[PDB]
């Protein structure tokens, strides 16, 4: 019921296990390289179907891509309509985290490109109409098309720019925002956004019906267009290793949160749980799905009742 | 016959349309290049020896992997006997991203290449009799230092060329790899960046060696001899650059192909500067294409027509 779009990739993620504050002609030493499954739509879609959700992955993908969908399929994502490239291979996403979680990274596009060439129509005559797209960063011009689609089929969306809103402009920006059930980004992402759309705070609010804004260690704030506002402190960590795709993480355990009836606060913490599990894994989706360490580490952060309530659904 | 020591490496190599200089952490760059290629400054070395038409042995450490790559380098007459093949690592891995200036942000994993340091030089001295010349190229660090130790007790001339592992090594272990070596290769940011992590001066490190080899990118190239003898060799200007990596690799490589033939050093040098802009005008350091004809048109109008003549001539 949720169609996740966004990019399909590869991940190289490596280690440097030293400081990049320290420091053309930059070299870093690795003594980790792990090649792995990601994408922000393959990370969500994963994680939702992880957590017992009904999603359709929408994205574009070269030839090489019949293991990942097995990976996915095994899990519930349903990836019927991911468009296979005849001619360009899934695209690559070159990373390496420092000591501090602090990343140097390269993204290589490739068969993503073509995901403008995807019908949102197509999907909704097939699977039915989504209950919520998650317009996640893709091709430029697919995110556009898709959130216009979004828009004129009277469907749901949930505005999800990350990694793409630096290469955005300021009016292909505004054009994703308006209308959006959700805004999802992370606090520097908020800004960005702001700056370079030039609309304030209040401009933003009064166009979508909620701002999601991660915090990074403060956890997350959700904030309605009036004002109110629902903060959740992080699921604290006690193994993080890699950041990569801990955004997708949370967006993927709040919108199951929701999906299954939850309200902000619940779905948040949720979101925080996913979030923590992929800080503590190298890959995106390389974490695993433990009911009793779940409901334990809930407890611990968000009280008894919280957790019950959360691993109930 | 040269003995090549260091890397063997896969090369990711992708072009990034923008400039690192504006974007200076959470550092992230669209890039529209992403190509995979043979590498290491060993395998680049041996290949361009072999290419030029050398006797050369490439000795250090692959994965299991390496049965395409000892192909391609058997192809071009690369000795390949000696290559160590680890049961468990994988091929080295370099992966880097090069900007509009052609500056470059990489990082580098070494995997097998860490198993260099159970290379014995005695075997290849005992399978194809002394080498003319050692290459301790960029390699595991413990392994460059046991390759300076065996040539210096075996009799063996050596080239020092620890160019992109300067970086890692430590003062001491710097200089336990230069008193002795027929050359020293650096560029110039890599030559001061030796004299201030060894503690020593350009008269320090010349009274322990043959003969220093110092490039200066647009520059050219300097040959200095102990005594202050000193031959600048202006580049080969590009027309097409693209991609910088493995440029030093090439030059040292057509160099000591040019001394090999038994070409003085200047003329070596122009040599070698032919092979360095053929691999900065391609993409992959072993993408390069010999052609006589233009080889002989570029040197030419850079040196010479009777320069041009005595290179292309051996
Ligand atoms: N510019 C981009 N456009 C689309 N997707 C992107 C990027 C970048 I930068 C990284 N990624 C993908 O995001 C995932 C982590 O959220 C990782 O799995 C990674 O593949
Ligand atoms: N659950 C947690 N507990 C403690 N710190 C956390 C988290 C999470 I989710 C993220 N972080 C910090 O935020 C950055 C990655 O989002 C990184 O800087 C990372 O250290
Ligand atoms: N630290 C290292 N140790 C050994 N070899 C290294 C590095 C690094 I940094 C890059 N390379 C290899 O050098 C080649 C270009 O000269 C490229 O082909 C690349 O594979
Ligand atoms: N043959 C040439 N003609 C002009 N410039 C050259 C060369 C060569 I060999 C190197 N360079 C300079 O060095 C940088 C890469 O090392 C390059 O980016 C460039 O600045
Ligand atoms: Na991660
Ligand atoms: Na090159």
Same mark, same amino acid.
């Given at each position: 019921?949720?169609?996740?779009?966004?990019?399909?990739?590869?991940?190289?993620? !490596?280690?440097?296990?030293? #400081?990049?504050?320290?420091?053309?002609?930059?070299?870093?030493?690795?003594?980790?390289?792990? !090649?792995?499954?990601?994408?922000?739509?393959?990370?969500?879609?994963?994680?939702?179907?992880?957590?017992?959700?009904?999603?359709?992955?929408?994205?574009?993908?070269?030839?090489?891509?019949?293991?990942? #969908?097995?990976?996915?399929?095994? #899990?519930?994502?349903?990836?019927?309509?991911?468009?296979?490239?005849?001619?360009?291979?899934?695209? #690559?996403?070159?990373?390496?985290?420092?000591?501090?979680?602090?990343?140097?990274?390269?993204?290589?596009?490739?068969?993503?490109?073509?995901?403008?060439?995807?019908?949102?129509?197509?999907?909704?005559?097939?699977?039915?109409?989504?209950?919520?797209?998650?317009?996640?960063?893709?091709?430029?011009?697919?995110?556009?098309?898709?959130?216009?689609?979004?828009?004129?089929?009277?469907?749901?969306?949930?505005?999800?720019?990350?990694?793409?809103?630096?290469?955005?402009?300021?009016?292909?920006?505004?054009?994703?925002?308006?209308?959006?059930?959700?805004?999802?980004?992370?606090?520097?992402?908020?800004?960005?956004?702001?700056?370079?759309?030039?609309?304030?705070?209040?401009?933003?609010?009064?166009?979508?019906?909620?701002?999601?804004?991660?915090?990074?260690?403060?956890?997350?704030?959700?904030?309605?267009?009036?004002?109110?506002?629902?903060?959740?402190?992080?699921?604290?960590?006690?193994?993080?290793?890699?950041?990569?795709?801990?955004?997708?993480?949370?967006?993927?355990?709040?919108?199951?949160?929701?999906?299954?009836?939850?309200?902000?606060?619940?779905?948040?913490?949720?979101?925080?749980?996913?979030?923590?599990?992929?800080?503590?894994?190298?890959?995106?989706?390389?974490?695993?799905?433990?009911?009793?360490?779940?409901?334990?580490?809930?407890?611990?952060?968000?009280?008894?009742?919280?957790?019950?309530?959360?691993?109930?659904?």
């Amino acid at each position: 019921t949720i169609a996740v779009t966004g990019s399909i990739a590869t991940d190289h993620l !490596m280690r440097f296990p030293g #400081r990049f504050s320290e420091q053309v002609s930059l070299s870093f030493l690795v003594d980790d390289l792990v !090649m792995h499954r990601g994408g922000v739509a393959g990370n969500m879609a994963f994680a939702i179907g992880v957590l017992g959700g009904e999603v359709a992955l929408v994205g574009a993908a070269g030839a090489d891509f019949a293991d990942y #969908r097995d990976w996915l399929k095994a #899990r519930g994502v349903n990836c019927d309509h991911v468009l296979i490239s005849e001619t360009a291979h899934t695209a #690559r996403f070159t990373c390496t985290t420092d000591v501090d979680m602090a990343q140097i990274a390269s993204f290589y596009p490739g068969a993503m490109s073509e995901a403008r060439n995807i019908k949102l129509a197509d999907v909704v005559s097939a699977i039915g109409k989504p209950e919520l797209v998650i317009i996640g960063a893709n091709d430029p011009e697919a995110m556009f098309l898709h959130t216009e689609e979004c828009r004129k089929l009277g469907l749901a969306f949930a505005a999800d720019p990350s990694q793409q809103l630096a290469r955005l402009s300021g009016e292909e920006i505004r054009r994703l925002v308006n209308g959006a059930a959700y805004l999802f980004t992370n606090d520097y992402e908020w800004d960005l956004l702001l700056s370079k759309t030039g609309w304030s705070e209040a401009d933003v609010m009064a166009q979508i019906d909620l701002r999601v804004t991660t915090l990074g260690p403060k956890g997350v704030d959700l904030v309605e267009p009036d004002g109110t506002t629902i903060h959740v402190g992080v699921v604290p960590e006690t193994s993080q290793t890699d950041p990569t795709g801990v955004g997708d993480a949370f967006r993927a355990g709040f919108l199951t949160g929701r999906s299954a009836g939850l309200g902000l606060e619940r779905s948040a913490q949720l979101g925080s749980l996913v979030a923590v599990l992929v800080l503590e894994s190298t890959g995106t989706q390389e974490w695993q799905w433990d009911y009793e360490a779940a409901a334990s580490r809930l407890a611990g952060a968000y009280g008894e009742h919280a957790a019950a309530e959360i691993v109930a659904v």
